[model samples]
Target chain A: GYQTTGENNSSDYQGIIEDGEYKTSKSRGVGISQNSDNLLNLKSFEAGLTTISKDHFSTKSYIFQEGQYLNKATIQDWLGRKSSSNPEGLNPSDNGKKEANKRNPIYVQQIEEQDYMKQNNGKLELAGMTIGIGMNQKDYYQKEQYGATYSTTISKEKRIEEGKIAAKKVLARVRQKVGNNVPIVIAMFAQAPNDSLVGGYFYSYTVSKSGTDIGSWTETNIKSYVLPATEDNKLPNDNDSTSFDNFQKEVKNFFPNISNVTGQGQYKDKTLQGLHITITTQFYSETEITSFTQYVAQAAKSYLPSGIPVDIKINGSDGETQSFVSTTGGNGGYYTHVFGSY
Target chain B: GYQTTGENNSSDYQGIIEDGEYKTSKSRGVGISQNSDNLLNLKSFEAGLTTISKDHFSTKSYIFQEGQYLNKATIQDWLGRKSSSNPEGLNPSDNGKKEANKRNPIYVQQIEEQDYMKQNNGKLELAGMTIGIGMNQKDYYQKEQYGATYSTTISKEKRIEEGKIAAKKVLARVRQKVGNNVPIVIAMFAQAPNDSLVGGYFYSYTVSKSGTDIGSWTETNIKSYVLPATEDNKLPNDNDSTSFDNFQKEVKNFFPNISNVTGQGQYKDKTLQGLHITITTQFYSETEITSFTQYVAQAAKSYLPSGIPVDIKINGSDGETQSFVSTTGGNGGYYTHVFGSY
Candidate 1:
C-alpha cells in the first residue's frame, strides 16, 4: 500500500489580499466569468435563455483580452450618449485645460467607467485562477529598460546570467545584514512606454501570494514560464459572448517571440513582446528587504550599462520609500503603487 | 567576436548592490562575492594596499556557498549574544535544561537570514562567472547544513510523461495571467533522508522562473540544469576558517542546495528511495507573487490528496508571519509568529 504523506491541497490553502487577514480556508472555485452585462445579455440571448442574467453565470477564463474588448465596447457606447465637453473631469476641467494649454503633460487621463469594470474583472479573473484548480503562476520576465526583448530566447540566457551576477553583487553588499541560506527570488521588469529611465522610474514592484520569507528560494528552485495569451487589441463593436471568446483565443496564442511574431510592431501582440513581470522571493522575513535592495542594485548593474542608474524602494508597513539609488539621480518618480496584505 | 551585441565589458557594467539601487545593471564579474565584504576584503588583500580601499578596487568572484558563509557569519555576529535563555523560550529557567531546551529559535531565524544572503550571493556569482569582474562582498558562516544524494535516473519515457503532466499544470495557471509564447525555465530538486519515516524525509522540489510580460525585463530567462553533486556531511566549526573552507569545498559538490541538508546519519552512506519537492516561481513585479501562489496551490491540489492545508505569505515587506508546531502539541508551543517591517 502506498504510504500517505502530508501534502498541500488547494482546499488546504488560503490567502490574504491588501492587508486582509491570513485566509486559511480552501478557496471557492475561481469566479471564472467577468461581469460584462452587455455580453452576458448577448450570450443569454444567443444561448436562447432570455430569462438568464449575466450575473447568474461567470466567464470561463479571465484573460485581459476578453475584458478589454467588453470594456472598450462599453465605453464607446457610453461615450456616444455622453457630451464630449463636460463641465468637469477627474482632474478638474479648468486645471486640465490649463495644463493642456501649457503642454504640462497632457495627463491624458481617459476615464472609462467601463475600463474600471474591465480591470476589476481582470483582477477577479486572476483571483479566480489563483483559487481555481490546476492553476499555477510561473516567472518569465523581470524588469528592464528596453522593451519586450526580454521575451527573446537569447534574452532569457542573458538575463539569467545577468540575474546571477546581480545576485552575487547583492550578496556582497548585504552579506552583513542578511545571513546565508536565506533563500531569495530577485525579479526585474521592463520600462513601460511612459517610464522615464532618467526621471526616476524606481520603486519597482514586488508581491507574494500567501506567505513571507524571501530567502527560502534559490534561482534553480524558481521557474519562469511565458504566458500563452495577450490582451486583445480588437475591441468588440458590441459586448457579446462570441466576441469575448474570440478575444480569449487570441490571447491564448500570443507568445512574445518563441512561436509568434517578433519586433516592436508586435509589442502588444501576445505572440510579440510587451510585458510586466512580478518576481516573488519565497518564504523570506521582512528584514531581508534591505539585503534584497542590495541584490536589486547588483542585478541592475549586471544588466544595465554604467550610466543607466537604478533605484531601490524598500516597502515597509508605511509603504515604499527610496532607500538606495545608483548615481545621484534626483529622486523623481518612485512611489507606492499598491497597498495590500498578503 | 562572439556577438558583442548583447555582452558588455566587465567595467562597463554598474551593479545595483555596489551603490544600493533597486534596478538591473551590467555585471562586472562572475560568482556572488562582488557585493560581499569579506570576499571583497580578500580580493583587496590579494590586490595590494593602495587598492584595498574603494579607490583602486577591481571586481571579484564568490559563488553561492561563499556568499552564504559570509552573509551568515556577518548576520550571526551582528545578532550577537546568543539567546542565553531562548529569547522566546517559554520558560527562562529551561535554557540549559536539555539540548532541545538549549535550542534557540534564533537559529531558525538565522537560517532565514542565511537564506537571503545566499540568494543574493547566487545572483552575483552568476554575474561574475559570466562577466568575470564586479563588486565584492565578504562573508562568514554560523551553522552550515550540507549533504548529497543520488536518484535512479528516470527513463526518457517516464521523464516525458512527468514533464507533460507538470507542463500542463504549469501552463493552465500561467496562461490565465500572462499569455503563452513567453519563455520558461523549470528546475527540479529531490532529497531523500535515512532515519525512520518519523525522523526521515524525502521530497522533490520544482521551481519555475518566468516573466509576466514580454520586453519588460532587463534580464528575463530560464534554464534548468541537473547538478549531481556528491552528498557528504562534513560539519565545520563555525569559528575555524580553515574548517569552514574545507566544509565549503566539500559542500560545493552540491551547488544549489545551500541551506538544505538531505543525507544524514547512515543515509549519507546508503541509497534511499522516494522524493519530496518544493516549487519556486520567479518574476519581475510584485504581481508575480500572485502567480506563484496560484501555481503552487494548483500544483499542490493536483499532485497531492485533498484536505491538506496550505498557506501563503509575502516576505520582504510588512505583515510577515510563521506558524510552527512547537513540541508537536500545546497551545503555547504550536503557535504562529508574526513580524512587522520596522
Candidate 2:
C-alpha cells in the first residue's frame, strides 16, 4: 500500500537509492563528447534548434554536459591513478593552477555557452584532439607492471564531486516532468565489473525516478541495480561459463520465469512500432540504427504503417550537424532506402 | 536440460518409527487376522471391502476359502517355536500333525476363503484382530522395558504361498484389462496425525500404467497420513471448529483439490470442504459422519468438480449406505442445497 498521508514529509523517500560501494557527490566540470579528455567546445558550435526557456537551457544543456564531463573525469581519474601522472594537472601547485585555467577554465560564461548550444538542436562540438598526455600514459601503463600506480589530481576532484552531475541533471529533468512534490531518486551504474575500484570498472551511468531528491541529491525513491557479479557473468556474451551457470541456476530456483536474453541487442529485442520514439543518436554505425528500427517495425507491425518511416540525425563531433534517411534491408532485415543525405 | 537417456533406478526405502526412548522398525505384521490368542477371530468378521468373483466358487459349491488363515503353523516351524499350546486333556503328548488337526479348523477355512476371494472382484477380508502375545520378556527371562524394539520374520509356507497365488490371480485379471507392464504399489496412511493415533488409518494401493508389472513396489510412491491432535478435548466432532480445520488442512495438503462436503441426514452441520471427496470415516456416530462428510465435500470442491453434478456414497456403521448429489447454479452455487435423506 502506498502512503499518501505524509505528502510533505521527506522521510518517506528513504532508501530511494540503495547504498552500495559506488560513491556520489556534487561538483562542476566541462562535458567531454568522447570517452577521452577532449572537451566539447561550446563557443564554436552553432544552434540547430534554439529555446527561450532558461530553466531547460541551463539545467538540461549545462547540467547534462557537466555530468558527462564528471563521468569522464571519474573514469580518467581511475585510469590516471594506475599510470602515476597528473594528466589534467590538478596537482596542488602554481603550474597545475595555470594549466587548469588554460586547459579547463571553470567559469559561468563557459557553462552558459554550452547550455545555449544544447537548447538548440542537441548538438555539441567535439575537439578532434583527445587529451594526448593521458592517452600515451594509458598505453605505457598497460605495458609496465608499476605503471598502474600513477595519480592525477585533476581527475580525482572531478571523480568526487563533478562525476555525479550527470545523474543530478537527469534527476532534475525527471523531477520537472513528474513533480517536485513527489519523491524521486537517481541511480548510477558503471558499465564494467571491476571489483577493486570505487565503482565497478566498466563505463555507463543510469538515472531512475525515485521518491526523494534531498537537495543533497541523495536517492529516496529509486531501486538498486547492483547486479550480483555471478548473474552478470552468466549473460550469453559473458565468457565466464562456470560462474554464469551456477548463478543462472540459483536465480532460476527462485524465479522460474526469468529467461536469459543477453545476446538480444538493445531494447530486449522486443519493440513495438506504435510506441512513441525517443531514440538516442549515438551509435558508431548506420547498421545499428537500421537493425534497431527494422526490429521495431517487425515486432510492432500492427501499429506501424505499410512501410515504416524513421527519423535520424547525427550528433556532430566537430560541431557540423546533418540529418539522413535510408531505406535498406540487408543485414538481417535493415532499412535499404536512402532519402535525405545531410 | 532434462536427462532423457538414463534408465530409472529405484532406491531402497528406509525409515524409523520412534517410541518413548528408543527407535523401532516401521514394519507391519501380516498375520494379525489368524492370531487367535491375540483375539483375532478371522471366521467371525470382515474388515475392509471384499468383492467376490463368480469363478471363485466351484460348481459343487465347495466353500472356496483358501487364503483366509495366517499360516501361523508354518511360521512357527520356521521360527523354531511350538506351533500351538496343548489342549487341556488331549494334545500334551500329541505329535505336530495330530495337534494341528485338532486346532480350530475355522482358521484353516478362513485362509482358504481369502485366497478364493482374490480370483475375480478380489475382496480382501480381515477379522479385525491383533496377533502375537505381549512381548513382556525379551528372549530368555530378560524383562524388557516398554520401549521400541526391532524384529524381522519370514513369510510362512501356507499363507505366504497362498497369498502370492491370490495376488497372481488378481494380477492376471488386471493384466488382461490394463496390460502386463503396469506397476502396482501399496501404501499405508494413518487417519490421525503422528500425535493422534486413536482414529485408525487408510491404505492406498495404486498401479502405474507403464509397460510391466514385475511385482515391484517403490518407496517413492508410498504416502503416509497422520491426523493432528484435537485441541481442548474437542474429540473432532463435526462442526467442531478447530478439529475440522486441522483435518481439512491435512487432507487438502495431501490430496490435490480435496475439500470437505456436508453429510446427509442430521450430520450435515459438522465438517469443512476442500478438494478430494474425503469424509473422516474413522469415528462412529451420525455426528462424526457428518463432520467427515463436510470435510469430504470441502475436499471435493477444492480438488474436483464445481458446477457439474456429482454423486458420492459412504457406508455407515449400522450397515446403512448414504449418498448425495451436488449440482451447480440450481443449488445456489453448488453447495446451497443439502441432498440428504435417512
Candidate 3:
C-alpha cells in the first residue's frame, strides 16, 4: 500500500514484512518523479536574431537562454524596444548625441540649415547629405501613402559618395540660379539602421559665375550622431492622417466644452516639425482663455518631440485672437511656451 | 566887470548885479544864465518811432530822454536792439513769444512748417500765407541776385486776401499731385515792418479723392505771434553760399592733418534744413575720426537753426566711410549727434 500526501503522488511505496529469507526487510529507496506540466519550463533553448551589418563584417548577437522570453521576439520588435529605451539607439555616445536625437536624424541637418537661414534673415545657402539606415519601415509607409520611397540599402562608403555627389549637384544648381559669387554650403549625413542614429558633416566653397574656384572648400567639423526612431517618423503629407487626428483629439481633451476645433500637421523628410492648430470659440473671460492656452501647451509638450515647433490659434468671440508657439526644448528638456494675442 | 573865473564866461553879470524892482539900490538880484551849448541836454524830447501795428490801430511808443538814445536811432536799429534783448519782441508776455523771436518773423512760419515735417518723417502737405511786411530788404537782395523782384506794397487787407488765394492755389496744386485724400494744412503769417515780429494762425482739413468733404474744415488753435525778424531772413538759395564755405572752413580747422575738404548746402523754403557737408581725409585712428565728428556737430549746432537736420559724410583714406546726422534740438536746445561708419 502507498500513502498519498499531495494531490497526486502515486510513486510513494508501502511494504509488509514477511518471514521469508528472500524479502523480509522493509525496502527503502530513492524515488524519482516527473510531471509533464512542468517539462516546458525545464526545457533549455537559445533564441535570438543576429543583426549583421550591411557590410556583413560586423554582427551583434542578442542571445536568449532558457527563461528569456525576448529570444522569441522578431527583429522588428527588438529594434522597436531598443529604440524606445536605448539612450543613443545603435550609435556611440557623444557630445551631440542628445541634440541629434531631438528630432528625426535624417531631418536634423535640414533643421540646422533652416535655423541658420532664419537667423540670418534668409541670407544663406546650404547643401547637405542625409543617410538613413533601417529607415525602410518609414520608407515603406511613405511609399504606400505617397507612392514613393527614399530609403537606402547601400553600403556606408557608397552612401557617403552619393551624399557628396548630391551636395555637388545642389551647389551647381544654386550657382546657376544665384551666380558663383555666393558661397555654397555642403553637408553629409549617415543614418543607422532603424533610423535611430545619424552622423553628419558640413563644408562650404565659393566659385565664380564662370565656374572658376575662388577659394578652397572649407570643412566644418560639425558632427552629430545618435537619434531615436519614433513612431511619428514618416514623410509629410497634407492628406488626412493620424497626426491631425491626434492634434484634434488633444485639443478636444483640453477643451471639452468647446466644439469647434480644427488642426493640420505636415512632415518633411520623415520628420515631425510642422503642426498648425486653430480653434474658434466663445469665452466668458480672459481667465478661461488662459486656462485653455495652458492646457493646450501642456498637451503639445507631451505629444511633440523636442525641437519641433508648433503653431496654435484661438479665435474667441470676445473680439480677440490669440496665437501660441510651442517649441520643444533641447537636451531632453521641457517645452518652451510663447503666446500673443490681438 | 565880471571876474573871469571860468574860461571866457562872456555872459557873467557884473559883480554889482542889477535888480529891476529896487530903483536906488544896487542892481544885484538872483540872475539866471542860459547856455545854448547845454540846451540840447536840458530840452526833453519824445524822439522815437512809434511802432504802429499793421492795422495802425495799436501803437507802442518807445520814449527816449537824456539817457535813452534809442529815441535818436532809426527803426531798423531800434528793432534790432529790441529783437536781441526784448525777449518777446513786441508781443505781450505769454507762451511761445520768446520762441517766436528766434528768427525773422516772416521765416518763423516756414520754420514751424519745417519742424512739423521733420518730426513727422518729412511727410506733410502744407498751405500757408506769409505776409512780408518788411521783407523788401531780402526781396531786393534776391532780386539783385536773380534779376527779378518779388516785393509788394499792397495794403494789409489786400495782402491777407492775396495770401489766402496763394494758399488755396498751393492746396489745389498739391491735390493734383498727391490726390485729395491727403489732408491739407493751412496757415497764415503776418510780419511787422521791421521783419522782427510775426503773428500766425493755422488750421487743417481733409477731403476725399473726389473732392468731397470727409470732415469739416477744422480750425486749430495753433496760433503763433511775435517772431523776431533777423538779417538772415531771406529766400533760400542753391547757389554757392556762406554755409558751404563755413562747413569747409570748419572741417579744415578741425582736421589740419588733412588737406582735402569740400561741402555744399541747400535751403528749403528759406530754411537751412538741407545742409549736406562732405569731408575727405586721412585719419590715423578712431579718435581722430571722433574728434572730427564732434567738431562738425558743434559747428552745425551753432550755425543751423533748431529743427534743421544736417547730413555729414567723411571719406577716409583708410578705406572707411563715416556718416553723421546732426539735428538741432527744438526750443533752443543743443544738437543731437549721431555717427556711423560703413
Highest-scoring model, DockQ: 1
**Over the stretch A144-237, how does candidate 2's per-residue lDDT look in tens digits?**
3555422223333343244354335434543554444423222222211112111111112222324324244322111111122344332222
Q: Per-residue CA lDDT of candidate 3, range B222-241, in tens? A: 22111111246422432224
TM of each candidate vs. truth:
0.17, 0.18, 0.19
What are the fnat scores of the candidates, in the order listed?
Answer: 0.00, 0.00, 0.00
Model 3 whole-model lDDT (C-alpha atoms): 0.30
Global Cα lDDT for candidate 2? 0.25
Which stretches of candidate 3 lie above 4 Å from their native place? A1-182, A185-247, A253-276, A303-311, A317-320, A323-325, A331-342, B1-342
- Docking quality (DockQ) for each candidate: 0.01, 0.00, 0.00
Docking class of 1: incorrect
| Model 2, C-alpha of B3: deviation from truth (Å) | 49
Stretches of candidate 2 above 4 Å error?
Answer: A1-342, B1-221, B228-299, B303-342
- In model 1, the Cα lDDT at residue B258 comes to 28
Task: Summarize candidate 3's per-residue lDDT along A1-342 as a digit string, tens digits.
Answer: 211111111211111111211111011010001111121111100000010111111111111111111121221222231243553222212233222223222311111110011112332222211111111112111324456444424444544444454444444443554454433333333322332322122222222234533334333232221111135543243222454555456556333345356543433233444444556665432223444555555555655444554555565644234334344334343222212110
Better of 2 and 3 by lDDT: 3
In candidate 1, stretches whose alpha carbon ends up further than 4 angstroms from where it belongs are: A1-103, A109-342, B1-288, B304-342
* Tens digits of per-residue lDDT for model 2, B115-177: 221112332222111111111111111114574433212123433333333334334433454
User: Which lDDT tens digits does candidate 1 get at residues B91-209?
Assistant: 11323322332332111111110111112423432211110011101112223246332223333344334433433433344444334432332221111112212121111112223
